[PDB]
Each structure stands twice: as C-alpha cells, then as structure tokens.
C-alpha cells in the first residue's frame, strides 16, 4: 500500500496568513492526488483533485501543487471558517488501493495560557459502588501540549488513567483537559496520598494538586 504522510500533523495559524500543508507519498502517484477538508461531525469535502484542479464551488484561496511524491496545499489568505482537518489522498494505479494521509489540523493561534489545575476525590456515592475515580481538571490553557502524571503514595501510575480534551473554546481559543484515574475500591483504600502533576509551557514549574484519602 502507498503511504501518505502529512507532516506536521498540527499547524497553529491566524486568519489572513498564507498557510502551507505538506503531503508525501511512499512512491510516485503522478498527479493523482486529492485534498479534502473535514470539520468535526461532518462528511469530508473535496477541495482539490488531480493535484491542482479546484473542485466545484471551492473558493480561489485554496490551491494545490506538486507531483510524483511531493504535494502541497496552499491557502493564500486563511479565513475563520478554514479551521478544520485536511487530508490528502492518492488514487494512482488501477486496482484501486486508495489511501489517505493521517490529517493536518489547523488550530487558532493565540497567546500562551497556563492551565488552572483542579483535583476531585471520588464521591462517597461512587465509593459504595466498588469503584473509585479521581479527576484532574486542567482548565483554559494554550497551546494544546500538556502532560499529566498521576502519583499514588508518591509512586508514578501507569495504564490506569484516561484523558479527554475539548475543542478550542469559541471565545478564547483555549483547551481544557480531564484526566480520570480509575481504581478499584480495594486498591483505593490501600493508599493515602493521591496527586496529579501538571507540566505545561505556561508554567515555570510543575503544578501538583494532591489530597489524602479521607480528607
């Protein structure tokens, strides 16, 4: 199979600037290269086919170029409705074997905002059920890259947390992030100190929020 590579996978851009998205193929696909735009919860939208031809109804600020293995999508002046994910796709040899790139997401550039960290112990209503969940909230930060480390009695946790991150907020373009440490009831009662440690670009040092089980 032909491997399409879209590097970088994210670009932080502002309205009005010229943005360039890159596409690389593992072998020559000539000009048989298409570009799609996708917004969350919506079907993909054809932007470009045959490497450089604009699809029907596509505004002139989108333009494709390149050949063989190297391809480029240019938005000459970015508009606010252009923030989406962009996929390239080859369709070269006859027995179809169509493949897509993994996507390049355009995100709104803003100033660095440090997260506000909040930790939530399990509720007694949940504790009676036989499962305990600790929630670490990282609120209104930018950029997207943040690390949450869990420590249970000052020992690093592995494989028992799940993370979830909002889209960019429609007002301030920040992100929020939850980390849920999920433990069995017995394991939760066996330890005292529960902590999440947050490292982010807007923090000068790691932020730790902790509690001792049973306040």
């Amino acid at each position: 199979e032909i491997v399409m590579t879209q590097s970088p996978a994210t670009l932080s851009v502002s309205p009005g600037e010229r943005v360039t998205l890159s596409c690389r193929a593992s072998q020559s696909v000539r000009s048989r290269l298409a570009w799609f735009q996708q917004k969350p919860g919506q079907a993909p939208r054809l932007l470009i086919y045959d490497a450089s031809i604009r699809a029907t109804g596509i505004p002139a600020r989108f333009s494709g170029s390149g050949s063989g293995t190297e391809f480029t999508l240019i938005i000459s002046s970015l508009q606010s409705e252009d923030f989406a994910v962009y996929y390239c796709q080859q369709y070269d040899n006859w027995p179809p074997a169509y493949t897509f790139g993994q996507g390049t997401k355009l995100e709104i550039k803003r100033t660095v905002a440090a997260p506000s960290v909040f930790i939530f112990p399990p509720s007694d209503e949940q504790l009676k059920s036989g499962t305990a969940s600790v929630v670490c909230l990282l609120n209104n930060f930018y950029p997207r890259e943040a690390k949450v480390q869990w420590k249970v009695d000052n020992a690093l946790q592995s494989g028992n947390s799940q993370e979830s991150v909002t889209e960019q907020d429609s007002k301030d373009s920040t992100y929020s992030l939850s980390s849920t440490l999920t433990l069995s009831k017995a394991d939760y009662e066996k330890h005292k100190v529960y902590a999440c440690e947050v490292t982010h670009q807007g923090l000068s040092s790691p932020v730790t929020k902790s509690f001792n089980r049973g306040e």
Binding site: A34, Q38, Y49, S116, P121, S123, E125, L137, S164
Partner: protein, 226 residues
C-alpha cells in the same frame, strides 16, 4: 441537488453481521463508480471498498478483505456493504462516496466530490445502560484564585450520547463538557465541569442535568461543596 444518503448502521455484537445501504438521487447513478470510506473514533479516513459502475470489479482494503462484500443495484439507485466478522476496530462512521464518472464506459475521476452524511457502526458486546452520575464536589483542592471548579462524572453508559446542562440551562458561562471516552468495559464515560466564583459556593446551588435518551434516564444531580 445531487444527493447520497446512507443508513443501516447501529449496535452489533462482536463477530456479528450488518448490512449498510446508500441510496443516491439527483444524478445518473448507474454510470458512476462507488466507494465506501470509514472513520474510526478520533482517527483518520480509511478507504474500505470500491465497486465499478457495471458491478464488474469489486476491490477491498486488506483490513476488510474476505470479511466485507460490496454490491449495488442500479435499478433502485442503491449501494450496499455487507460486514461480517465485525470487530471493535471496525467501529466507525461509514461513508459512501461518489467516484469515477463513466459515460459509455469511458471513466474520468474528478475526485470524490459527493459524499453521504455517514452511518455509525458500533461494535460492542455491551448492552444499553443508563449512566451513573457522580458529583465532582468543589473543595480547597479545586479552589485556587477566586474560582471554584465543580462538575459531574457521567460514568458507565451505553450507547452514546448523553446531554448535560447546568441549572436547567441557566448556567452556560465557563461550562466544559468533555468528549466521551471508551472504557475497557465497553461503556462510555465523560465529565462536565464548570468554573464559578469561589465565594458563590455557600449561596448558589449547582445542579447538573444529565439526559440519556437511548435508555430512559434523566438525572438531576446536586453538586455541593465538600
């Protein structure tokens, strides 16, 4: 208008079968090649299947070959995908897409310009289950500046989705409802948080309203300071 419309997706037990259908209107369907493209949750697009206009050639991605079967019926303007041996990695939004234009057999590609809205296939051994709603109670561990954070943990429900409001819609400022995560149990779980002024906790009552329309679950959970 040119139109593609899918349906047929839903909940399937692992190793089960499901048949998706995509009906076309507004164009000459019998002269176009047709594609099936799917998208895993949080992942990128993956091409699955091709069928020529004449039904003469049917081709598949290796991840689905031998398990899936594409077909079409040009009389009813219909495209079909039979999915067998379904696995949890086959859980996706499935789209039908228009392919090459072949008047009189002479094909020209022009791109996948017309797509359907997508039909969702969820492969799980889980059953329909209403959520448990637990409070994320504000405390000194969630009060920092002059701002408290509080929330609701909407845990162990199937299938998607749930809706969460705060104070029956009166509270929208500073509300963040997270995307659902898929737990190892096969059940979904999310959190909804809100930041309020910390000096509001003794006087303002905060209630999260969780609604799960697939089951018959409507919960109002009071979130009180700890």
């Amino acid at each position: 208008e040119v139109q593609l419309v899918e349906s047929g997706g839903g909940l399937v037990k692992p190793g089960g079968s499901l048949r998706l259908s995509c009906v076309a209107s507004g164009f000459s369907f019998s002269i176009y090649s047709m594609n099936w493209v799917r998208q895993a949750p949080g992942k990128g697009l993956e091409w699955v299947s091709y069928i020529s206009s004449s039904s003469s050639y049917k081709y598949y991605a290796d991840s689905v070959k031998g398990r899936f079967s594409v077909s079409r019926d040009n009389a009813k303007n219909s495209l079909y995908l039979q999915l067998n041996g379904l696995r949890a990695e086959d859980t996706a939004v499935y789209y039908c897409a228009r392919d090459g234009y072949c008047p009189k057999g002479v094909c020209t590609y022009y791109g996948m310009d017309v797509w359907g809205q997508g039909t969702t296939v969820t492969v799980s051994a889980a059953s329909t289950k209403g959520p448990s709603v637990f409070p994320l109670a504000p405390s000194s561990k969630s009060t920092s500046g002059g701002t408290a954070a509080l929330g609701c943990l909407v845990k162990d429900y199937f299938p998607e989705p749930v809706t969460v409001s705060w104070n029956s819609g009166a509270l929208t400022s500073g509300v963040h409802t997270f995307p659902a995560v898929l737990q190892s149990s096969g059940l979904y779980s999310l959190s909804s948080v809100v930041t309020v002024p910390s000096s509001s906790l003794g006087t303002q009552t905060y209630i999260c309203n969780v609604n799960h329309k697939p089951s018959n679950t409507k919960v109002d959970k009071k979130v009180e300071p700890k």
